[PDB]
Amino acid sequence: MQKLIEDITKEQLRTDLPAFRPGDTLRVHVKVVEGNRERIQIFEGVVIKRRGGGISETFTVRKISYGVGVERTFPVHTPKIAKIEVVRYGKVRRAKLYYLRELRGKAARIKEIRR
RNA sequence: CGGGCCUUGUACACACCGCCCGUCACACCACGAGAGUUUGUAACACCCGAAGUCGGUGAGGUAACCUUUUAGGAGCCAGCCG
Ligand SMILES: [Mg+2]
Ligand SMILES: [Mg+2]
Ligand SMILES: [Mg+2]
């Protein structure tokens, strides 16, 4: 990729994010604005993908909520995320965990790493 | 044709101008059948699997106790797994 696009966008890259990879469990603290009030909704879930480069990098987290799978895809460097905290590092064998979309319950379990 | 007497059969006794059977028509009621539709009951097979007990683990943590004292150790426990 152009150094020029890299240079224009460098200022908007967040530095405060922890290293995570697909299979890690995050709590993503999302700024939310229902009404005029501002509050933090937490989205806890498995990272199922992380694609793209630089300011365009996104990640997707998946949770089962009330018996329904939910995925939220965020720009890595969105200012709408207050913070990300890694709950547990998973042991997976690939970059994209789309096979989890078809699994529920015990079949959908990811082993932890001592990282 | 009307009547009299004996006898006999009779489901007749308003007493044969008696009684009475089945369809058909009409109304109402209950019931059966009926392409189906719908509601519920008790099971069964498989999938999934909470809580909890129990059994594994426990590289993590750990007032009481043993050895010793800045300690290991025992036992305990979170978590994990069945
Ligand atoms: Mg990548
Ligand atoms: Mg005479
Ligand atoms: Mg009927």
Side-chain angles (χ1 to χ4, degrees):
Chain A
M1 186 190 316
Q2 266 283 14
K3 185 181 158 62
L4 186 65
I5 301 292
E6 289 170 9
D7 291 358
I8 301 153
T9 58
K10 256 190 292 184
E11 61 177 286
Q12 296 211 316
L13 298 176
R14 300 193 77 187
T15 55
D16 62 347
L17 298 174
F20 62 90
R21 68 178 69 180
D24 300 353
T25 307
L26 306 182
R27 291 164 189 294
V28 177
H29 297 248
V30 175
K31 292 152 70 177
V32 166
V33 186
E34 64 182 358
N36 289 252
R37 301 200 316 108
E38 157 55 57
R39 49 167 283 244
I40 285 164
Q41 196 182 22
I42 297 179
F43 191 97
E44 192 182 355
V46 191
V47 179
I48 68 165
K49 80 192 284 188
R50 168 159 195 178
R51 70 147 294 294
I55 201 69
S56 293
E57 194 171 15
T58 58
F59 71 106
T60 296
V61 286
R62 180 181 172 67
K63 80 182 186 150
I64 311 301
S65 149
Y66 296 93
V68 174
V70 183
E71 292 177 17
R72 287 243 52 221
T73 303
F74 300 99
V76 162
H77 306 282
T78 184
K80 227 75 180 286
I81 291 170
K83 57 167 178 181
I84 300 181
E85 49 197 47
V86 178
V87 175
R88 43 190 291 263
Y89 298 98
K91 205 275 181 169
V92 295
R93 288 287 253 127
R94 57 192 76 264
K96 310 282 188 281
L97 305 185
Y98 305 135
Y99 68 87
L100 292 176
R101 292 171 177 165
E102 276 60 62
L103 304 177
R104 307 293 283 275
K106 302 254 274 203
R109 292 183 304 166
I110 292 166
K111 280 189 172 179
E112 194 164 348
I113 300 184
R114 311 179 202 170
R115 185 175 283 168

